[PDB]
Amino acid sequence: RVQHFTGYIEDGRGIFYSLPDMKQGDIIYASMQNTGGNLDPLVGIMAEEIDPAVSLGQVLEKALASENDLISELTAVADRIFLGWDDDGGKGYSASLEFTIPRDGTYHIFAGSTITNQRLDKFQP
Amino acid sequence: TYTTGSFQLILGLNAPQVISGEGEPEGEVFASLASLEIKPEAHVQELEIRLDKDTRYLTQHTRNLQPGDTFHALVEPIGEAPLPRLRLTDSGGKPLAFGLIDQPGESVELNYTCDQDICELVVHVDGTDGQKDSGEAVYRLLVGINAPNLRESGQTPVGS
C-alpha cells in the first residue's frame, strides 16, 4: 500500500494529511525529499491535529536572542508535539520514519520545514 | 624517493585468474584488514587565534572523517578575555553540536561522533555577544581526532 503526494511549503507553513481509522499493529512508513528550492524536510505523526506553528515559533524566538542551542531546544519541543518524527534519516537532509500504530484509531501526518542554519559568515536560524 | 597515491588490491585463493588482474569477487571471504584489530591513531593540533574588533567571527575547515570516528575540541583564553561561544556545523551550515561550559568555567568543550560515510566539519568560534570593542582578546584552541585525552595531552601535536 503506497501513495504519492506533492506540495509546496511557504515560510514554514506545514501541511496536514489524515490517516483515517488505522488498526493496532500496523506499521507506517514515511519519506520526504526536496525537489526544488532550499527546503529542509521534516515529518511528524500525531493523534489530535494541532498546529505546531505556535510552539515551534518559540524555538526561533529563543535562539534568535541567545545561545540556546537549537538542537537541544528543537528535540525537546518535538518530543512533546509529536509521537514520532525524523529530521535527516535519509539521503542528505531528507527524512524517513517508521512508526508502529499504538492503538486503534485515526492519526495525522505533519509535513513541513525544520529550523536550520545555512550560512558560514554568521549564525541565523 | 617514495611515492604516494591510491591503489586497488585484488587477492585470490586458488584462483589462477587473479594474476591476469581481472578477477571478479567470488566465494566466501578469507582475509581482512589488520588495523581493525587494535586502537586508532590520534591526531592533535593546537592553534592560537585572536578576535579583533572587526574580526569577531572565525571559522575553520576540518579534514574528512571516516565513519565511526570521534571529534573533540576545547578553547581556553590566554588571559582575562571573556569566554566565546563554540559550535560545530557541516559544510552547508547544518548544526551538529554545541559547546558546553564546564563547572570550572574557564573553558568550553565540544564532542561529536561520525555516522555518515563522509563527514566534512566546520568549527565556529564567535565572540559577538554584543557590540563591545574589547580590543585584542586572544584565545587558545585545541582540537583532536580520535584523541579523547585532549584535556591533558602531554605529547606535542602528533599525526597530520
Asked if residue A88 belongs to a known ligand binding site, the reply is yes
The helix (run of H) or strand (run of E) holding residue B48 is strand B43-51
Nearest chain A Cα to B91, which residue?
A120
How far apart are the two ends of chain B, measured CA to CA in Å? 20
A88 Cβ contact list (under 8 Å, min separation 6): A94, A95, B94
State which amino acid sits at residue B147: A
Q: What is the DSSP letter of A111?
A: E
State which amino acid sits at residue A21: D
How many angstroms separate the CA atoms of B129 and B56, rounded? 9
Q: What is the number of residues in chain B?
A: 160
Nearest chain B Cα to A73, which residue?
B98
Alpha-carbon torsion, ordered A33, A36, A42, A48, to 10 deg: -100
State which amino acid sits at residue B85: R
Chain B residues whose beta carbon lies within 8 Å of the beta carbon of residue A90: none
Give buried/exposed letters for B111-144 (b at 16+ CB in 10 A, else e). Answer: ebebeeeebebbbbbbbeeeeeeeeebebebbbb
* Residue of A97, A103, A115 whose CA lies nearest to A17: A97
Q: What is the CA radius of gyration of chain B?
A: 22
Best A34, A38, A62, A69 residue to mutate vs chain B (most B CBs within 10 Å): A69
CA distance A96 to chain B (A): 15
Provide the phi-psi class of A21: left if phi over 0, else alpha when psi is between -120 and 50, else beta: left
Residue B38 is placed in which grid cell?
Answer: 587494535
Residue B143 is placed in which grid cell?
Answer: 582540537
Using CB atoms, which residue from A71, A93, A120 is nearest to B122?
Answer: A120
How many angstroms separate the CA atoms of A114 and A89, rounded? 13
Up-side HSE of residue A99: CA atoms within 13 Å toward CB? 25
How many angstroms separate the CA atoms of A123 and A103, rounded? 42
How many angstroms separate the CA atoms of B109 and B88, rounded? 11
Nearest chain A Cα to B118, which residue?
A92
Best B61, B94, B119, B126 residue to mutate vs chain A (most A CBs within 10 Å): B94
Q: H-type helices in chain B, by residue range? A: none
A72 Cβ contact list (under 8 Å, min separation 6): B98
How many angstroms separate the CA atoms of B77 and B86, rounded? 13
How far apart are the two ends of chain A, measured CA to CA in Å? 37
How many angstroms separate the CA atoms of A3 and A109, rounded? 13
Overall resolution, Å: 2.7
Q: Are the C-beta atoms of residues A84 and A45 closer than 8 Å to each other? A: yes
Using CB atoms, which residue from A69, A72, A121 is nearest to B57?
Answer: A121
CA distance B92 to chain A (A): 6
How many angstroms separate the CA atoms of A34 and B45, rounded? 38
Q: How big is the A-B interface in CB pairs under 8 Å? A: 33
Q: Are the C-beta atoms of residues A99 and A84 closer than 8 Å to each other? A: yes
Q: Are the C-beta atoms of residues A113 and A39 closer than 8 Å to each other? A: yes
How many angstroms separate the CA atoms of A80 and A99, rounded? 16
Asked if residue A121 belongs to a known ligand binding site, the reply is no
State which amino acid sits at residue B144: G
* Residue of B141, B131, B157 whose CA lies nearest to B77: B141
State which amino acid sits at residue B40: P
Chain B residues whose beta carbon lies within 8 Å of the beta carbon of residue A93: 94
Q: What is the number of residues in chain A?
A: 125
Q: What is the DSSP letter of B56?
A: -
* Residue of A116, A115, A111 whose CA lies nearest to A14: A111
CA distance A102 to chain B (A): 29
- Number of helices and strands (H, E) in chain B? 0, 9
Q: DSSP letter string over B94-106? A: -EEEE-EE-SS-S
Across the interface, whether the CB atoms of B95 and A93 are under 8 A apart is answered no
Q: How determined? A: cryo-EM
Give buried/exposed letters for A14-26 (b at 16+ CB in 10 A, else e). Answer: beeeeeeeeeeee
State which amino acid sits at residue B155: Q
- Number of helices and strands (H, E) in chain A? 2, 6
| Cβ–Cβ contact A123 with B under 8 A | yes
Count of C-beta atoms within a 10 Å radius of residue A30: 20
Alpha-carbon torsion, ordered B146, B149, B152, B157, to 10 deg: -10
The helix (run of H) or strand (run of E) holding residue B109 is strand B108-113
